[PDB]
Amino acid sequence: DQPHVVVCSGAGMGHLTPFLNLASALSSAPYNCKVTLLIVIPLITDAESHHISSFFSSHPTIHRLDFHVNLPAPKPNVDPFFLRYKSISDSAHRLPVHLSALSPPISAVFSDFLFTQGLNTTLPHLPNYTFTTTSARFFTLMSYVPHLASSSPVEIPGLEPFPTDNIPPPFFNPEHIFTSFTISNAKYFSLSKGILVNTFDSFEPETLSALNSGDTLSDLPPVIPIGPLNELEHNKQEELLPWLDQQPEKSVLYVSFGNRTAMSSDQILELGMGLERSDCRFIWVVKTSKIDKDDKSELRKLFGEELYLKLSEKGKLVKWVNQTEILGHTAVGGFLSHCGWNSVMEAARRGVPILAWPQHGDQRENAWVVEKAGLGVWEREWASGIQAAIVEKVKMIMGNNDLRKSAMKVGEEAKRACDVGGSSATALMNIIGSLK
Ligand SMILES: O=c1ccn([C@@H]2O[C@H](COP(=O)(O)OP(=O)(O)O[C@H]3O[C@H](CO)[C@@H](O)[C@H](O)[C@H]3O)[C@@H](O)[C@H]2O)c(=O)[nH]1
Numbered sequence: 001d002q003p004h005v006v007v008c009s010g011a012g013m014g015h016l017t018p019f020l021n022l023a024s025a026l027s028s029a030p031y032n033c034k035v036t037l038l039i040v041i042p043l044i045t046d047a048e049s050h051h052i053s054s055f056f057s058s059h060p061t062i063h064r065l066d067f068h069v070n071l072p073a074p075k076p077n078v079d080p081f082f083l084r085y086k087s088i089s090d091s092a093h094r095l096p097v098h099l100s101a102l103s104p105p106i107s108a109v110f111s112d113f114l115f116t117q118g119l120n121t122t123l124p125h126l127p128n129y130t131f132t133t134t135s136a137r138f139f140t141l142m143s144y145v146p147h148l149a150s151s152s153p154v155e156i157p158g159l160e161p162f163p164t165d166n167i168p169p170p171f172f173n174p175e176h177i178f179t180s181f182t183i184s185n186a187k188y189f190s191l192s193k194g195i196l197v198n199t200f201d202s203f204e205p206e207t208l209s210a211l212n213s214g215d216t217l218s219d220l221p222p223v224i225p226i227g228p229l230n231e232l233e234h235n236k237q238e239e240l241l242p243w244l245d246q247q248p249e250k251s252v253l254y255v256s257f258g259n260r261t262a263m264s265s266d267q268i269l270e271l272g273m274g275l276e277r278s279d280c281r282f283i284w285v286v287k288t289s290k291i292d293k294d295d296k297s298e299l300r301k302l303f304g305e306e307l308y309l310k311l312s313e314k315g316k317l318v319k320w321v322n323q324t325e326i327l328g329h330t331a332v333g334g335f336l337s338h339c340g341w342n343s344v345m346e347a348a349r350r351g352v353p354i355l356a357w358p359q360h361g362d363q364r365e366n367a368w369v370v371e372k373a374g375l376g377v378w379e380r381e382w383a384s385g386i387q388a389a390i391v392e393k394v395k396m397i398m399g400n401n402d403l404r405k406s407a408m409k410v411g412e413e414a415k416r417a418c419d420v421g422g423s424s425a426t427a428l429m430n431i432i433g434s435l436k
Contacts (some may be wrong), residue, residue, distance in 0.1 A: 003107040003435040004034040006065070007097060008119075010112035010133075011040055011084050013047055013259055018198050020055050020134050022110060027062050030420070031432050036063040036102055040088055042071055044081065047320070049257060054235045063407075067098060081260070082177045085114055089181040092118020093161050096390050098125070105267075107435040110196065111187050113191040120191035127193040127427035129224075129431065134341045136197045136204040136211070136223065137369050143217060145171050146183045149275035153156045158216035159207065163391055166364040190219040194431070198227035203373055203410070204260050216390035228349040229416050231324045238325035238350055240283060247281060250333030250404075253315075253394055254326050254352075255284040257338040261359050263287075267386055272303050272311055274390025280333065280398050282315035283326060292321045327352050334397040335376070336390075348375055349418070351411020353397045353404060357382040357389075373405030 005026060009019035019037070027035040037056075043049045056064050069091045072083045091092040092115040111119055119128045130314060132139045144156050148171060153161040172178035174183060189195065201208060204225075210216045211223040244252065255261060255275075263271075268286065275282055288298045297315055300308045311317060323343065326332055327350045334353045335347045344366055347354055354376025356367035367378040377397065382389045397403060417424040 001031050002034055002280065003432065004036065004102065004104050005432075005435070006036050006106050006111075007104070008038045008095075008107040008109060008111035008115050009040070010024075010088060010114050011044060011048070012081055013045070013051070014342055015112055015133050016048055016051065017342055018131065019110075019112065020051070020230055021232060022131065022226075023062055023366055024055075024059055025230055025428070026110075026230055026432070027059065033432060034063075034104070035061075036106070038065040038098075040069050041066045044071075044084055045259065048307055048345065055232065058233065058235050059152070065098065065102070065152070067095070078177060086177055086181050088112075089114040089117065089185060092116075092143070095119060095124045096122050099126075108193070108431075111168050113189075114181065116185035116188045116192065118235075124191065127435075128191070128195050129196050130189060130192040131196040131198075133198060134362045135366050135369050136199050136207045136225070136339075138365045139195065139197060139223075140207060140211060140217065141167065141171075141191055143186050143220060144357075145179060145187040146186055156216055158210040158213075166368070167363055175397070179228050190221065192221050194221045195223040197223060198229060198341065199225045200227055200348075200414060200422075202413045202417070202423075204256070204369060224427050225417075225423050226343045226429070226431075228414050228424070230418050231328075231346075231349070234322045234325065238321075238322040240321065241325065241329065243316065244283075244326070244329045246332045247331040249330050250398070251280055252329075253278070253282040253334050253336060253398060254332050255321065255336040256343070257285075257357070257359065258340050258343065259287070260340075261287075261338055262354055267383070269302060271390060272307060273386040274305060274394070276310050276314065277387075277391050278321045278394045280347055280394060282316060283321065284317055285319065285321060285430070286317050288319055294358055307372035335374075336394070336397075339363045339370060341366055344370055344375070345414075348373075348410050348414040351408045351414070353377075353400075353407040355379065355393050355397045356368045373410055374403070375410045377403065378409065411422050 007023040023035050023037040026033040050252050069087050072087045110129045110131050113130050153163050155161040170179050246375045309358050327346050335352045340358045354370050356376050358364045359397040370376040371378045379389050379401045416422050
């Protein structure tokens with residue numbers, strides 16, 4: 001009968017939502033698995049807590065397993081999420097006693113890469129699919145981190161070189177907190193049954209081809225595209241939908257840099273000045289210390305009254321959205337994004353052209369993948385002239401006919417890939433089929 005599988009989620013929105021999406025897909029037709037979704041508690045952000053609660057309330061047949069990992073003490077000059085990621089990696093070896101109590105006996109685990117060493121050493125007989133949450137392109141660099149020595153381009157044989165400006169500088173320091181648990185877990189990728197990627201074959205064909213053909217990266221297991229993951233339905237309907245319903249097709253710019261972006265007040269002000277001068281309407285997710293989603297006093301102070309009024313007449317300034325509901329609306333014509341990979345793939349699914357302003361980490365390589373696929377354009381020096389960058393490029397994404405067509409073609413292939421019979425759905429069905 002039906003396989004029982006465990007999905008091991010990590011921490012942070014970007015490392016949570018693809019695991020929720022996978023859990024949801026595997027619990028439903030045509031996969032029809034019994035799914036236990038492991039959640040690391042405590043959670044760090046309220047966004048995480050509400051997303052998880054809402055998920056389990058709307059997926060009653062999915063079983064929740066709370067995996068308690070003590071919060072690490074803060075340390076000066078160490079990022080709190082990196083400290084949390086390290087605590088998860090350090091705790092993964094404790095999973096045997098927790099997974100052994102599950103019934104019926106589990107057939108497989110699908111896990112964040114932070115769990116790799118713990119799962120592949122203490123549960124070596126349990127098939128572990130390491131589900132990376134970044135692009136296939138950046139995953140290859142991460143898997144190569146244990147072999148780094150430099151300020152030269154990194155050339156993984158068989159792949160286009162990685163320029164220095166696209167590699168997080170900490171990757172060259174094995175003692176950096178992030179590099180340390182990247183190295184310790186990448187060293188056990190070879191014991192994973194496969195690497196799953198939230199991507200699709202026609203989106204990263206050169207990378208996937210190299211990895212698979214053998215070799216580049218001899219010792220990796222098969223690297224399997226399973227994206228885009230079919231979207232969740234959300235408990236509460238998106239509050240901006242009736243307004244979006246009133247806008248012409250493809251006339252609204254969606255703007256979001258996510259929870260992990262550190263834009264200063266000066267940068268936010270310049271961005272607002274640029275938007276006020278553009279012709280399109282917008283939805284802009286702006287971070288505010290006030291907890292009430294409706295309190296705009298901080299924005300009024302930041303922009304000043306005249307600018308704020310003009311901005312609020314032309315678009316929506318909000319604290320949070322259901323992103324997939326926004327990107328799925330016919331009124332949204334473009335996406336100014338930091339290119340966090342979940343956001344890239346949600347835009348790919350809907351064929352939404354991207355204006356890429358990457359901030360840190362994998363985002364520059366993600367932006368390059370987006371530009372190479374024809375899904376968007378990457379503004380390499382956005383931070384050196386924010387207002388001008390906005391005025392010139394927003395008009396272009398919103399109207400350029402060639403980019404609109406190439407982005408639409410990405411959307412058609414992305415939809416095809418996750419539909420019944422799609423290349424990604426076929427790959428996932430074959431994984432589940434191999435458990436029966
Ligand atoms: O207002 C919001 C903002 C985000 N989301 C959702 O949250 C997820 C965000 O994903 P993403 O943008 O990828 O996550 P980030 O947390 O911003 O990004 C982190 O995680 C990604 C995946 O590993 C990386 O590519 C980034 O570099 C990293 O910083 C998506 O599913 C979005 O739909 C919303 O629903 N509403």
